Each structure stands twice: as structure tokens, then as C-alpha cells.
Design an enzyme around this catalytic site. Sequence first.
Site, short mmCIF file in Angstrom:
data_model
loop_
_atom_site.label_atom_id
_atom_site.label_comp_id
_atom_site.label_asym_id
_atom_site.label_seq_id
_atom_site.Cartn_x
_atom_site.Cartn_y
_atom_site.Cartn_z
N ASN A 406 0.80 -1.25 -0.01
CA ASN A 406 0.02 0.01 0.19
C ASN A 406 0.70 1.20 -0.05
OD1 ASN A 406 0.60 -0.89 2.85
ND2 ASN A 406 -0.84 0.85 3.41
N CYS A 408 1.92 3.18 2.69
CA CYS A 408 2.97 2.96 3.40
C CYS A 408 3.53 1.53 3.14
CB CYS A 408 2.71 3.21 4.99
SG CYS A 408 1.71 4.77 4.89
N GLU A 410 3.03 -1.53 4.74
CA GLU A 410 2.56 -2.35 5.85
C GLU A 410 1.55 -3.22 5.42
OE1 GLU A 410 -0.46 0.67 7.14
OE2 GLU A 410 1.07 0.40 5.61
#
EC number: 1.17.4.1
Length: 776
Positions: A406, A408, A410
Site C-alpha cells: 500500500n 506506507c 505495511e
Amino acid sequence: FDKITARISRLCYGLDPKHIDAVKVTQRIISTTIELDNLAAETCAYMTTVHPDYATLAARIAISNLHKQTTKQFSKVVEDLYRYVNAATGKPAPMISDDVYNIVMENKDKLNSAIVYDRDFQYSYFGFKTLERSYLLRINGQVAERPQHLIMRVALGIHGRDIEAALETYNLMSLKYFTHASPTLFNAGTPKPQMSSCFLVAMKEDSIEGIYDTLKECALISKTAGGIGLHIHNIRSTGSYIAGTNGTSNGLIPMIRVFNNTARYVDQGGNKRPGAFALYLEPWHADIFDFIDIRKNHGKEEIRARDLFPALWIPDLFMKRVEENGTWTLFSPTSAPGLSDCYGDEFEALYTRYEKEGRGKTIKAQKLWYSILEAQTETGTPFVVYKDACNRKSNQKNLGVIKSSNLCCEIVEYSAPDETAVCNLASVALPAFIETSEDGKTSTYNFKKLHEIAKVVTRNLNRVIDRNYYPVEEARKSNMRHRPIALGVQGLADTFMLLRLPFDSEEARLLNIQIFETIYHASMEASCELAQKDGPYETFQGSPASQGILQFDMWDQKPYGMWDWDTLRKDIMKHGVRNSLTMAPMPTASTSQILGYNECFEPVTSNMYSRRVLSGEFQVVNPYLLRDLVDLGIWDEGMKQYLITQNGSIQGLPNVPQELKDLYKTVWEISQKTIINMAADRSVYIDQSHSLNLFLRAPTMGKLTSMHFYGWKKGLKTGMYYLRTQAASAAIQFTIDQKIADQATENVADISNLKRPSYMPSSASYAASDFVPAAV
């Protein structure tokens, strides 16, 4: 005229009239009733340097100021927000949902008298102001909501008619034990509650229809908060066939500029909008070289795009080729199809066959390397996520092939033209589980409380799935099938400091392992309980969890053993779990700021830094360190200047005990081989992945190279989120009187005057909070 010094001196208790001096405060106001109070809190913040008890003073002012100019009672605030007729358009523009308005009104007494308005005083001055600026709902640019109201609303937004579960969530949140992600705080309980944070969007089809559906979908997602990972592997490179042919294709860049433009468009003004897409591409794509440079300032501005973030979706094979000094082939996906749609061995066989049959363009592997490290050095990007690690170690691996992460790095969830992966996020406040012995001299970490709270948060996130307002049908389709969830943490750093552990200590190494093992266990346990109530998620049968393989089994790792995995595994194999994934520690950029804790699992980046404006520009020092220096007697104007020239570093003072120095090391001062180790450690209890930034002082291709190769070899998923760099010369700064700043190293410290609890470790068998009674 004044004697407001009375109003002000009223608010100090646990003060010290020499430390504080309410008199001094009034003088610094060298220039209606509310205007003065603002300045009173502003200036009173400014003196956090003067004494650390000024922070507390400035918070009180801002808070009980907010009280005065705001309706105490929850139901009435809910009324006003629901009744809001738009000041200039005459027509009803309500800010609470019909549903939640009804629940509030139907349960107004029980609700109204649960709130503890004292808990508004739990906020750092700066934390409060973050809420105030973007989170507390406003009537006519006037703040309507107290913090407590925002929390109750959020709790009701999540739990609906479950008032019991809401009261509980209200209590834990108002006591800063955990918090939900920004979108939840913004939108829970409002007309169209979009509460999810992340969306992973597949480029639908290599065609104008494909592209423009994806664009529309992205615009819709982005406008309702929530950020995008978008994989674009399937789109043809520069110079490729098009039916209606004379035109050869223009490749990715032009397309990317369309997306960049939409990103900027949707971000219309008054922010709430993570106007930010990350794009994901595998390094064999024939446009990789341009893609990789997307964010650079210099160069050609046609070929550029700064509202976007490039991210690499890397096969092991590429790392293999750069590691020997091998060749690497670039392909158009039309000429070399299905590459994005297999992984590990299946990929090396397909890729290699395409190589051998002379498709695509042969280049030197290390040439791409080099360009990559170069972009990272100037721009912090592109991100690095290892595609084989993700696909081999995903509980969702049965859905197909995961093509992206995504915004960021994660979340790691399957996605396809008709399924957009979504995820809800919350973070646990790690400091909240420190417990101090009665006598104040030994501390302990309550993993049982932590386990409990994580089960609560797992239940919340699971409910948001059902209560969420999905901006596009692909999102809803996916989320109801797989019900993924993302728990993360915040304040790791503060808890190491509070426990007097150096970040890179053996004790911290182990606490890291323990915290993460327990959260993973908690969420799996809660999720199994929910499967026993509502059935497994649709897609559970045949998943790795269904064969009893948990995350750490995929890493061939025995769990630390603080919790009973043999029982859970058996339970899961028999009852299933409600959620396909539960762990993905996020950057907690805005939430940690609210709660007054450090970013997430990152070490403190600086022991001294600036906070936002209001009548000047604010210099501020690490609170734990500050109290330590004040307790050591050492704290000077001079100590302050020294600190400003060393940019918050404490490592140069001969003056100060080694222990202190180890405790307050900065991300720049901590080995990156250590950061990655700890990342690799917790990774075995992470379903998905985590937002691992890397930090370098005097960056050289070389330490940058061995940084990548190291993470990759430890089998990380996210090799690197952003790369953060700092010239060695930035590490030193000017101050107005350099020789006063020098005298600081001559200050003599106590020690018999600095005491601080000492941490009792726990083990896989010995609790500790069990055996040491806490304070009150």
C-alpha cells in the site's frame, strides 16, 4: 487590565512556585477574553525550555479554555451537529449519521454520564492542538466537540447499538491505551463513514477503459480519505503495438502523469485527504528507469510527478542478478505476459524461458541497481517490497498472487481487477502497559493487560468492516470475503526510555519480541472467538491458517512461547478465524502526535526539534531526557545551546554517564543492522508487513547496498519504506553563543539525585507483573 495571573496560578498543582512563577508568565505577554488565554498557553509552551512543568501548564490552559467555550454535555453537542443547517445554503447539512443520532438520543443518560471530562487533561499541549486543528468537529469554524466527545462518537461509530462494547472502547481510548487510524477518527459516526485507511487497487486492464475505470476508482477512494497502492505491471511499455496502428505506445510515464494530475485535483484544499498514491512496479518492466525517477527535482519536467510515490515490487531473481554481476531483461508485459502473476520458482522458470527465447532488452543488472540507489539518495524513494517474501509468507496466498503493498508499506493483501483490498488500522499505546512497583523503584511490563486490549482492538476493527461505507464496490466485495485487519503499535521508543532500556539493548531486543508475540497471539485468539460466533471468513478453507500454519511457521521459526500456540493452533484448525490477517504496524504519523508518543517502532529521530507556529517558531527537547538533565542538575541555558549545536545529540558530553548516552541515542546513532534485526524479529508475528523506514548519516552506495542486501537475506517483506538521509554536516548547527554552549560540558552532574525504576524482564514462563504489585 490584569490579575489573570490568578486564573493562571490556579492551574498549577504539583507545581513549584520557583520552577513556575505565574508572575513571569504575565510579563512575557508584551503586546477577546479568549485571545489572551490562547497567548497564555502559547507563551506558557515556549517555556518548556525554561522548565518541563511548563508543558503541563500550557496543556491545562488550552484544555480548560476549550471547556469554557464549548458545551459540556455530549447529547447536546450531538444535537447541534445533527441539526446543523448550512450557514449560507439554508438546507440541512448534518454531521452525525441518522443511525448514531438515534442511538445517542435513545441512550442519552447512560452515555452522557459515562464521560469523564477530566480525561481531556491527558493531552500534551501539542497533541491537543493536533486534535483541535483537524479532528474535533466544528460548527461555524468553532470547535464543537471536546476530545471526550470525539471519542464517544468514534466508539458509537464502531459499536452501534452495542452500548456495552462502546462504553468499554470509550474508556480504553480516553485513557490513551490505544487509538484508531485518522479516517476512523474523522468519519466514525458521520453520514458516510469511510473509516478504512488503505486500499490496494489493481490496474484493471491494459486499455483506455481499464485505465479510466482505475482512475475513477482511485479518485473515489482518495476523496473519502484512505490512500492507494496501485500496481501497474500489466501496462505496455514505450513503443508497443496498438490496434488502429500507426502509433507505437507512449508507455507508463504519460499514464503516470494522468494519475499524478488526478491526485493533485482531488486534494481540493482544506485537507483530510492523503492525496498520495503509491504505484507498484516490478523491476523487469521496460519503463522501469523512468518510473524509478518519478520524484526527482532536477531533470525533465515532462517525465516527472511529485504527488505520487514509486515503489518497487522486487523478485528474488533481480537481487540474485545484481549480486553476481549478471544480466537483467526488460520486457513489455504484452511481449512477456504473466510475469506479475507468478512468483519464486514459477517466476524464475517463466522469466528465464522468455530470456532464452530472446524476448525483451538485455541490460546489466547492477546498472538498474545503481539508478535505484541514486533515486533513493535524493528522493527517499522508491520503496522496496520483496515480492517473493510477501507471496510465500501470506495467509492469503491461496487467493492468487499478491501484486503490491500500500501507500506506507505495511499491508500486503491480494487484489485483482474486481477486488480492491482494504484495511482498517489501529495502534496500541505501548507506554500504557508499563507498571511501577509501590516504592517507585522497580518497573514491569504488563503483557496480560496488553493481550487483553489487543483483543478489544481486534474486535473493534472487525466491526468496522461491517459498519464501513465503501467508496467503490470492489472494496466491499473484497473486504466481506477476507475480512483483513491491521493492528500496529506506537510509542516503542518511549517505552524503552521509560524502562531505561537503550534501543539496541539485549533487554529491548527481547521486549520487542515479546510485545509483538503477544499482540499476534491476542488478535488470533480474538479472531478465533469471533469465528466461533459468526463463522470463519469466506475464504478460510484451504488457507495456511486452516492447515494450522501460523505466520512464524512460514519463517521456520519457533515462537518465543510466552503464550500457548499449541492450543490456539488447534482451536483455529477446528473453529477457524474471523479475519484472514490481523497484524500490520503502520507509521502512526498523526495518531502518535495526538497521544504524545514517538512514531511507532522507530527510535527517536532527534532529541531536539521544532513544533508548529503561533507567534514565533518552537524549539523543543525530548521530555524524558529533559527531566533527566534537570534531575542531574546539569540543565542550563548552555546545556540548551550545547544541545542545539549537536542537534539534540548527547553523545559528546564527557560530563554525562555512559548509561544516559546509550539511552538517548538517535536513529542516526543506532546501527541499521540492528534496526533490521529487530524488524526481522517481530516480522515472524506479523501477518502482513511493517512500515520500516531506514536512516543513514553519510550515505554511500555501499552502506545503502549492504542495507538492502541484508534485509532481503533476512527474508523481510518491506525492505525499505522511505530512506531518510542526513549529511554529516547537518549533524552540527550554529548557535548564537558558541562558547556558553561549550561550558556545558563542564557542568557537574549528580546521580544520587537521578532515580528511575529498574525494569524486571519477563520470560516465556515468568510473568512479572503477576508478582509485583503496581501503584495507583
